[PDB]
Design a protein around this ligand. Sequence first.
Ligand SMILES: *[B]([O])([O])[C]([C][C]([C])[C])[N]C(=O)[C][N]C(=O)C1=[C]C(Cl)=[C][C]=C1Cl
Ligand SMILES: *[B]([O])([O])[C]([C][C]([C])[C])[N]C(=O)[C][N]C(=O)C1=[C]C(Cl)=[C][C]=C1Cl
Ligand SMILES: *[B]([O])([O])[C]([C][C]([C])[C])[N]C(=O)[C][N]C(=O)C1=[C]C(Cl)=[C][C]=C1Cl
Ligand SMILES: *[B]([O])([O])[C]([C][C]([C])[C])[N]C(=O)[C][N]C(=O)C1=[C]C(Cl)=[C][C]=C1Cl
Ligand SMILES: [Cl-]
Ligand SMILES: [Cl-]
Ligand SMILES: [Cl-]
Ligand SMILES: [Cl-]
Ligand SMILES: [Cl-]
Ligand SMILES: [Cl-]
Ligand SMILES: [Cl-]
Ligand SMILES: [Cl-]
Ligand SMILES: [Cl-]
Ligand SMILES: [Cl-]
Ligand SMILES: [Cl-]
Ligand SMILES: [Cl-]
Ligand SMILES: [Cl-]
Ligand SMILES: [Cl-]
Ligand SMILES: [Cl-]
Ligand SMILES: [Cl-]
Ligand SMILES: [K+]
Ligand SMILES: [K+]
Ligand SMILES: [K+]
Ligand SMILES: [Mg+2]
Ligand SMILES: [Mg+2]
Ligand SMILES: [Mg+2]
Ligand SMILES: [Mg+2]
Ligand SMILES: [Mg+2]
Ligand SMILES: [Mg+2]
Ligand SMILES: [Mg+2]
Lengths: 216, 202, 203, 213, 196, 196, 201, 220, 204
Amino acid sequence: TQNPMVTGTSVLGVKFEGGVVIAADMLGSYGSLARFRNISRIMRVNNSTMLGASGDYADFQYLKQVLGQMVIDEELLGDGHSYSPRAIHSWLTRAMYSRRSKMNPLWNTMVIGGYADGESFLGYVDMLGVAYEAPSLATGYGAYLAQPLLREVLEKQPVLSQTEARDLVERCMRVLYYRDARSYNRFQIATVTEKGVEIEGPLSTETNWDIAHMIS
Amino acid sequence: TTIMAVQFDGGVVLGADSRTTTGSYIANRVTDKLTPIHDRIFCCRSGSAADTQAVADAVTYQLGFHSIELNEPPLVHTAASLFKEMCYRYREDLMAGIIIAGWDPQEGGQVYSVPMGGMMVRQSFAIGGSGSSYIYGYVDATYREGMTKEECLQFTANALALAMERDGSSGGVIRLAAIAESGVERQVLLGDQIPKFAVATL
Amino acid sequence: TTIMAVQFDGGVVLGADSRTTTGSYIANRVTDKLTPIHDRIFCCRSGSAADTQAVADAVTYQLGFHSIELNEPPLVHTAASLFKEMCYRYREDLMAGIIIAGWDPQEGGQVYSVPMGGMMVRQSFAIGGSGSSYIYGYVDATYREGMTKEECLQFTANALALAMERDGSSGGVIRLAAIAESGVERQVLLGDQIPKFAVATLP
Amino acid sequence: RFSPYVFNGGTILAIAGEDFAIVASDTRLSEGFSIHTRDSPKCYKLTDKTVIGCSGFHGDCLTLTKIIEARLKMYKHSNNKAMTTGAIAAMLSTILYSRRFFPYYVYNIIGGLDEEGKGAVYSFDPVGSYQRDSFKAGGSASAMLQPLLDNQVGFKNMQNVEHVPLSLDRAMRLVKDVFISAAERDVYTGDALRICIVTKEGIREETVSLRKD
Amino acid sequence: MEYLIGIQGPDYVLVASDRVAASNIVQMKDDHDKMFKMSEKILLLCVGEAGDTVQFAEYIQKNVQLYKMRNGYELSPTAAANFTRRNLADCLRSRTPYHVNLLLAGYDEHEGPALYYMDYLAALAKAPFAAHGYGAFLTLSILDRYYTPTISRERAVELLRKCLEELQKRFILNLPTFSVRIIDKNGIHDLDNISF
Amino acid sequence: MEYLIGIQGPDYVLVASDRVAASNIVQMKDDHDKMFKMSEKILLLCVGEAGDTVQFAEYIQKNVQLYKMRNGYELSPTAAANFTRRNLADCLRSRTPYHVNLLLAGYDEHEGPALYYMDYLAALAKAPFAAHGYGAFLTLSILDRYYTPTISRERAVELLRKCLEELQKRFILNLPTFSVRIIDKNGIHDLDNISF
Amino acid sequence: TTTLAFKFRHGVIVAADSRATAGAYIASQTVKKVIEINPYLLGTMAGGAADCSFWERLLARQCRIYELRNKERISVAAASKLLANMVYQYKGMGLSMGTMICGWDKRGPGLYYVDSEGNRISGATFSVGSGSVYAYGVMDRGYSYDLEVEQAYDLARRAIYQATYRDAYSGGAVNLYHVREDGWIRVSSDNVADLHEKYSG
Amino acid sequence: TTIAGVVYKDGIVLGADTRATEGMVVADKNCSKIHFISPNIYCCGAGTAADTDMTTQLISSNLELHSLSTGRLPRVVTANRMLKQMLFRYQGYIGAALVLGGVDVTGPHLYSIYPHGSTDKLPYVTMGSGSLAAMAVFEDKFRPDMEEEEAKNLVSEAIAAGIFNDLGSGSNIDLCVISKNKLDFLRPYTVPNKKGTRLGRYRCEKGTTAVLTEKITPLE
Amino acid sequence: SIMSYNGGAVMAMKGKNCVAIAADRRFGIQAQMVTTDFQKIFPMGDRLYIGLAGLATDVQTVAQRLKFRLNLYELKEGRQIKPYTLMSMVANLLYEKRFGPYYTEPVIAGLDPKTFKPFICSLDLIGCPMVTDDFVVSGTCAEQMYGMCESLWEPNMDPDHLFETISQAMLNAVDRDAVSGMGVIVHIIEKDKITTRTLKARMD
Ligand SMILES: *[B]([O])([O])[C]([C][C]([C])[C])[N]C(=O)[C][N]C(=O)C1=[C]C(Cl)=[C][C]=C1Cl
Ligand SMILES: *[B]([O])([O])[C]([C][C]([C])[C])[N]C(=O)[C][N]C(=O)C1=[C]C(Cl)=[C][C]=C1Cl
Ligand SMILES: *[B]([O])([O])[C]([C][C]([C])[C])[N]C(=O)[C][N]C(=O)C1=[C]C(Cl)=[C][C]=C1Cl
Ligand SMILES: *[B]([O])([O])[C]([C][C]([C])[C])[N]C(=O)[C][N]C(=O)C1=[C]C(Cl)=[C][C]=C1Cl
Ligand SMILES: [Cl-]
Ligand SMILES: [Cl-]
Ligand SMILES: [Cl-]
Ligand SMILES: [Cl-]
Ligand SMILES: [Cl-]
Ligand SMILES: [Cl-]
Ligand SMILES: [Cl-]
Ligand SMILES: [Cl-]
Ligand SMILES: [Cl-]
Ligand SMILES: [Cl-]
Ligand SMILES: [Cl-]
Ligand SMILES: [Cl-]
Ligand SMILES: [Cl-]
Ligand SMILES: [Cl-]
Ligand SMILES: [Cl-]
Ligand SMILES: [Cl-]
Ligand SMILES: [K+]
Ligand SMILES: [K+]
Ligand SMILES: [K+]
Ligand SMILES: [Mg+2]
Ligand SMILES: [Mg+2]
Ligand SMILES: [Mg+2]
Ligand SMILES: [Mg+2]
Ligand SMILES: [Mg+2]
Ligand SMILES: [Mg+2]
Ligand SMILES: [Mg+2]
């Protein structure tokens, strides 16, 4: 892709004790047009790993196709080795760098969440092959609006329960709906734990419009 | 932005969404885009926030002075002509898509469009801003001659809700105003009060 | 262009305007933008006339061969995937906004959007082309779950008529098709048969 | 105009002693006016005797360090010994030049022990020009660090000062001070300072806190 | 392309300039003079864009002469250099900037000899020697190598000659002849041209 | 910037070229030779872009020599000029065009003397006299004025000298010395350099 | 950068400064700009640091292969031509290199200028780099084929020094070499701040 | 820059960071971004530093002329009109992005003012390169009618969110609290960042620096 | 960059009851040094100096036009200008050219003409003032200067120690900058005297 077409906005991620949660709205925007209002931007990769994608949705679909086939191929062998969240993150890093280095990027920014061997994994990969790990992540406008909130909570309390991480993600999704002109109030939350990957939705946040009467 | 106004027998209904954007950042989620120009004359503003506020302030000034000199309420057509004169003259330096609507004792309820470029045309109803694209078909199919005030309010709220759902540059709350001889009635639809249409699941 | 398709229980309805333009010259006022890809699978075409014709011809060929090999009617999802694969791979060289709709015995009536860029998504109803901007509101307000075939035909004709009135790039006649297990039924609305809504003149 | 580069910040430093080498970096990873993470160090262990610092475009930092890792194993396999510090440096020059027409956007400094056990520092430009130095700063705050090192390690512009050998404990003090000064003024340098001390006993690690704004 | 050089000794300033006026690939004049007499003990040497050079130099010249007529005595070299500067700087951001590079040479009864350098941006520097043009690139290091503050006038003419011979040898342009003048307590003296 | 000139008489061709190799504002060599011996009775004179000029001239030279070794006799001037042209033209729309301008001078046992002109586009013209370089602008009219087809070799050297003097007088570039050679039935003869 | 070289009765003097720059940032004051290709051949560097070092190292490799294959020292002409032919292919791609190849072979003292624009020329004296115009002035006013050895060292040293003074992109130290019939020798390395103390109008 | 304001029960709280940058280099660690307009009106500035300084000084001065003449305390609406009409006239070339807050006869009022001359009257606003970080804090925690200490807590948290997440922001948090009864100009309010302490000493004794020339000139 | 055309560096620094101001001495045009004694620091008072780095022509014009204003100010008022007031005067002069500025970024160093309290500041090219309690820097090696100043400067230094610190900060900073140097000048300002020194410095 040279020119993204239908795109998705922010993806959030935060580690908790026993797992990771990611969130993304269900909107594919076409410029300013909220065109496709019911698409999932989250993928279950395998039992330990999930992926969320911002940017060009067709490029995301292609990655889903490629990565889904790679896990199938590995499952065919039935040999006791599975791609860890970290391995998938590495593979993605290479794939994005390689596409960048041919001047033909996949136009996406992604969040990989996982749980393997008692460790939570959260990692970021962008269209240029920039990748890293962190206790919380937020792409797009999420980096400006969500991430400050995530990091401020994580400083007062680095270890969050599942229900605390989930309340915190809901608060961030609300702020994004207030302040990002490409968001939509219909989202999914995906969780990975010991038990595997669960994707919930469609979800909505409550909103408050009291300020409409305080033109102050 | 999405803006709209509709004539009824004895008055007008105006509406707007409430979103101000810089890029895709929402700088104000509860903007009041319906601005009083005189006691029974409003403008709905779309385009540049700075340009439309400056022009509205200047026309409020001109119209107020004119009205004191004549010692009578101003004509809605006069307010519209003042907008037009300024938007046409400075069309190369302004980005302003305006609807002027109000009531006067000579011609009753009136709606005027002053789109970008500075032409002026009277209409039964007018829509403007970026979100208006998404509701041409809706309003063309739904408009009926002889609607009551209450039907005009419903028609306007529905149209604006549909536009706000689809236009990234529109959103927030719906602000409505009704103008008639008896005065101006303003209200806000927020949250669950905004008309709702289901997303189409398989 | 305005194109549209709608699922009903047992099939699909498709529609298109009939206008081909170069600049603001109408090079064809009665274009057929709904093209058969197999017995019960059509595509509606918007964007570049050359690109969409080439891609439709190539898919027809791929799907026809696939269908003989399998000795079974093709899946609508397969036709859509073939369109997608070609529209995604060549997204930098194509201007094609496609709707794939049809019937097969496994999944019944189905509608797929393949917009520019080459994503694919199944929908209850789809709209595309330049004129589709003007009917988002209309379709969002008017769509009802569980519409009959005849209601889907009326809904489609109304939507297209509204778009054609407003979009300079859409116009002419409305071409409709209904696809179901029993086959394909095609018709044209022209002149006075096109739904009409008054221009809102001053009281 | 897709751009294949972005600047992600980062300051690197190395110092050669008589029987040690220091490679230090801040741990901030930035982009635009944002911080990606506060815990992304710019140093990578190559052998027991050699550490490399890399800053610049992080996509290239990651790729290049993975290429270096693969080439060290290849060298060991064909030659039956670990690559020396000097050979790593000469190799890296060639890897950087292979991209002369689409460069790695990376500033590299190698710190390690040479074959007599003495400290060795090699500094590089992005396309592979290099040389051996006594000390060197690189990256975002290099222009802030280098003059102080010139003065205090090189003894430049000072009269009537004994040119003593650089102890480990003075070099450490210097390292911490220059980073604390850089964090004051370079918006990209912050969060934490990571120090690797290479000696004949191995490689040890200190970390010190830096300003978070 | 134009060459100017100045060398200031203890009680004189020596100056020289090429005598070419060129256009496209031809020398159109081989006896051109780039020096303007401002006063009995002041030369302005001016190069740069066509039209701007004469218009600027002559304006300054006429205004320096006017000062003399109004006041009965002359501007000092330093005052003339600063006057020149103020005009050039004041025009820099105007509708009529002058694209000129200059040396100003002078002898003052009380300050002695002075050489001033100015570029088109109107930065002014006093210097013991200086040069303008592409030719300066090949000759300034010859001046750094051999100049001393007490250089006699015979040795300054020799040093000048070394610079001019270096242009013959090494410079791509055909600059075969140079105007030479000296300023001292007794005014402005024409020396013989240095030719090749 | 580089000057080539050729003058063809009844039984000889006289050629000359400047001896400057320049870079930016400096002459870096003053005894440069722009002539390549292709055979006993053929000179190729080549100017143009750095790298292209020598690579192209030497490729041709080697191939002309190779023809001699394969065949036992030499290419004629005409055949060498056409070979030269084919190569230049064939490269013109390739990935490796050569930006060179050339004279080819020769004496053939049966056709007599010949002078050929070629530009970088690879247009080839036979001519009784010709020149390349900016210098050509100032000298071609001198050749049109005084050349005759029966010009003797002594008079051709004088005419050449008038052209070179005109460059000294009127041309903006410093070209102080020239290589001179003459080709006849007895081969290639070096004449004295014409220097200033 | 300022580099220079000249042939004279006693061989070839080769000298350079030692500054590198990244824009106006001084990146080093200790660059070795004279490369030892073999014990009878030197190359100088000016332009792009990576380009010069890569291509001159490659020249060194090739001269050594040549010597192994042919059982004789490569000539100065041949070495300079190997470099010219290697860089020619890259014209227009933005290589920046200006080199002197300096030796003593069966034709005696040898000196060739070679650059990334495609020039290759023999000559008696050259200076290359951003400070070359300054060095040319001093070198030219002092040069003679019949310079004594120590006079020649003095000239080279002074010319580079004067270039460091005028040219913002030249500085550090003066590094001086002498190619003699039995090999080059490194003559001296003098800091420009120590040379300033000493010199000399 | 991160600047912000909030309307609380009894007034206005304004906030700001104290970093100024030139390129991506900190030029001032302790820049004062909360500007006096009148005894009851202050104005935070973001954008081009000379323009925020000069624009607020000019309007403060013209407002002083206005109040001297009326004998009354100025109104916030007045500062707003004056600032916006000037910024509109300059078409966005005066790069002042402002948070204007005060308390007047009609009570507390808060406005954000943009360089092209648009203004929005709102109960909480933010500007600068850290404005989204500070806005996220406000959306998450603002309540109407907060008490004084709650509102101060909230504005400092919002400024802190800019300081720590925005490379254009840093150093201290300054506040200004304005009510009918009081003006508290709290500079600094908080010092969340500090230079580390120096581990070595570079106390260079006399004669370390070689000297070429010296001249003493005695004064009175 | 317009500001690197002539190169140059200035800095000022505060001690106990004293201030220091320093500058390189190079006047050059791009790569070419033209002179090595170019004045960049100018007396605006007995105990108040302004240093200007940037485009040499504007260094000179801003110094001169500032002097014009100051002289008129002093004749009209009773008195020597205060340091803070000079800053403001300079701010006003620069901002008048907000839409076609002088390309110079001055530093001011002085003692209050009545109290002798230390004052230092700098301004940007359009007149934004910055007062500090330690040091200020301006020129083409600002980053180098920041690095030296941040590492060396300490509170309440005596005249001898302030001299050493400003000197070492300047010399080492300019030694990493191709278009600054060729000499450094330093003025120490005390109640009772001004001390002016040129430093031993690299000349490449
Ligand atoms: B609507 O046309 O989308 C809306 C209507 C205005 C009248 C409120 N327009 C905008 O939001 C356009 N935005 C701006 O003019 C703007 C706002 C801000 Cl906060 C800063 C810069 C700009 Cl250019
Ligand atoms: B519709 O998208 O407006 C319509 C649909 C096509 C599929 C029939 N598209 C066009 O009319 C676009 N026009 C062309 O591609 C065209 C037509 C002609 Cl006749 C000549 C050149 C071009 Cl580019
Ligand atoms: B000299 O030509 O001025 C010098 C010669 C080399 C051999 C050192 N050249 C340079 O200093 C040019 N600079 C660089 O090539 C360079 C580039 C970059 Cl991207 C970073 C650092 C340096 Cl040093
Ligand atoms: B903040 O908006 O990022 C801040 C506000 C000012 C009031 C401190 N702005 C900046 O730091 C932007 N920088 C400057 O205006 C500036 C520009 C120039 Cl050209 C020189 C110096 C400074 Cl301090
Ligand atoms: Cl959808
Ligand atoms: Cl999934
Ligand atoms: Cl508004
Ligand atoms: Cl409009
Ligand atoms: Cl409009
Ligand atoms: Cl909104
Ligand atoms: Cl039609
Ligand atoms: Cl077919
Ligand atoms: Cl589409
Ligand atoms: Cl479409
Ligand atoms: Cl060295
Ligand atoms: Cl070989
Ligand atoms: Cl040669
Ligand atoms: Cl000498
Ligand atoms: Cl207002
Ligand atoms: Cl003035
Ligand atoms: K919306
Ligand atoms: K139409
Ligand atoms: K920092
Ligand atoms: Mg095509
Ligand atoms: Mg910060
Ligand atoms: Mg002009
Ligand atoms: Mg070529
Ligand atoms: Mg405007
Ligand atoms: Mg320097
Ligand atoms: Mg130098």
